[model samples]
Target: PPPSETHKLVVVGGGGVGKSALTIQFIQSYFVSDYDPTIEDSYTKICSVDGIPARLDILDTAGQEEFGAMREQYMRAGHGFLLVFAINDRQSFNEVGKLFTQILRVKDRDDFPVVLVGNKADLESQRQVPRSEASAFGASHHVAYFEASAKLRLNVDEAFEQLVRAVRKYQEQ
Candidate 1:
């Protein structure tokens, strides 16, 4: 192997949309209902993607976003973004659009490495965002989409790995 690769990814979304849960599930390999985001917002995990060693640096800035105060600071440096939204929350789904646009504005690019994740997929009864609908958005934005479950731990790892793939693919050009 040629020393693998390092990817800097940020998890961005509105509050209470399982942003921390997703990161915690992927990093710690468990589900936590009671979470304190103020303590450890940054995490690093080692894994392999596409047969290559991957060191994933995940920034879970779940707290400190009221009045939209501190996003661009982190958004600019991210190699890719995990645009998460709650399947049950329509507003959060819309916020995904706002957040993606904000990232594009900050990075000054029409296209970037991003993943559209509709979290809480296990709660299909509460879902307001349909899978087909989200898939359509992903197609329009040219990003990968996944319905994730932080509690059930479904598609949790694949989502981040896919983001790494997106970052690798994007930076290659």
Candidate 2:
């Protein structure tokens, strides 16, 4: 068999943080109107990137109260991670610790290409996770952070593109 397609990215966070929207934007370049509201656990998709048709498997994990163990499993498996929180929601931002801890719980070491994404950046009025706060969080965790609005397509592509670039550096080393 051809060398199994490599590289995996996982998006994990609290519910309504635009996790689904971010994933859809990254893959299909648009958002779906009627996504299943009852989705729990993880949703997996293989997406094409930058016209390369490279295998990009993104595990969209649920952010519910009940799926704690299931979330842990997905967190550990992710080679590259995108932890998203909605800028418009305070609760989502508050849950960043849980998100970071989930990743740390599963992975023995903390060294990985993880990006702290503040989604829904278009709603400036509703924004809760300020840029400074997000940057500080990323600094404390020693990872990259970006603010993006998946709905309006603001900095969304650039965020993922930068992530891929970071991953490539790892590959080079």
Candidate 3:
């Protein structure tokens, strides 16, 4: 059989939203608590979804607003995206919309492969963004939304797998 198809998946979100942590956990299964901004980093992993092999070239991007211009490049290079936000930070959740809009314009595609992710699910005590609201927004925008905690490895694999599946499905059509 031929090797698995390679898919470029980019993770984007506001600063301190756990984007890097999620990527690290998904790719390495290691949790990071230190909050350091990511400039850009890539990880390659073979993920099996629905009995099909998928080589994921995942890109972890910086979340600072000043780095918005760099997002165009990432968007152009990526086949799928994990639009993440911290569930405990309302501001981070709010920034998801702006980033999504930018990605669409940059990619010039209305229906791109993307999965909405609410990170920091373990921080329930400080929760700010309600799951229902995020889910509703995702549904209205025609995307799947997931609540995950990189700290606990909750839904980390599921989120990445779903994005890969969405990318595969999009490319198939």
Candidate 4:
């Protein structure tokens, strides 16, 4: 096989939305419970999408406004985005729209690759965002939507894999 293809995926959302937890869990196969605010972090993982070797460079961005200024740069560098939001935090859920809009503006394209993820699905009892609403938003926006729980590793791999596939498919077009 040829050398594995590589792509960049930027994960963005409000603070405490488990963006780090989701990325780390996907790359490391384990979860961290402690909540430490992120500045910016990157991780590389080898993934096989449809039996083809591929590498994913995942960028985890801080959720605070202090780091908001750097979002454009991150968006410009990423081939795709994982827009994450906490299911129990309505504010975080609302932030996804703003983030997605900024991404589109920065990327200068209407059909850029993206995945809208509602994190903390394990906390179903505390959910503030309804799955139907998220699904509808994704459908109307033409993006994939998934509910994931980093703590339980629910759909962690599948989410990343699907994002990678989308990125690859986008590039092929």
Q: Flag the better candidate by TM-score, 1 or 2.
A: 1
Angstrom error of the Cα, residue 115, model 3: value is: 0.3
* Count of clashes, each model: 0, 0, 0, 0
Stretches of model 2 off by over 4 angstroms after superposition: 1-5, 40-53, 64-69, 170-173
Residue 33 of model 3, lDDT score = 76
Is 1 or 4 the stronger prediction by TM-score? 4
For residues 85-159, could you state the per-residue lDDT of candidate 1 as single tens digits? 999999999999898888889888878999999999889999898889989989999999999999999999999
What TM-score would you give candidate 1 relative to the actual structure?
Answer: 0.92
Candidates' C-alpha lDDT:
0.86, 0.70, 0.85, 0.86
What tens-digit string does per-residue lDDT give for candidate 3 at 1-173?
22537888999888888888998898878998774674567888886788988888888887445543466777888899999999999999889998888888987877899999999888899999788999998997789999999999999999999998888889888
Q: After superposition, how far is residue 155 of candidate 4 from its true place, in Å?
A: 0.6
- Highest TM-score: give the candidate number: 4
User: Which structure is stronger by TM-score: 2 or 3?
Assistant: 3
- Model 4, residue pairs in steric clash: none
Model 4 agreement with the true structure over 1-173: per-residue lDDT tens digits: 33537888999888889988998898888998874674568898886888988888888887546754467777888998999998899999889999888888887888999998999999999988899999998998899999999999998988888898888889887
Q: Ten residues in a row with the worst lDDT in model 1? A: 62-71
Query: TM-scores of all models?
Result: 0.92, 0.80, 0.92, 0.93
Q: So what's the TM-score on candidate 2? A: 0.80
Question: Per-residue alpha-carbon lDDT of model 2 for 1-173, expressed as tens digits?
Answer: 11233557777777778777787777678876555545643444443456443455676666546544466566666767888888878788878777787677677666667788998777888876678988998999888888888877777666666565555556665
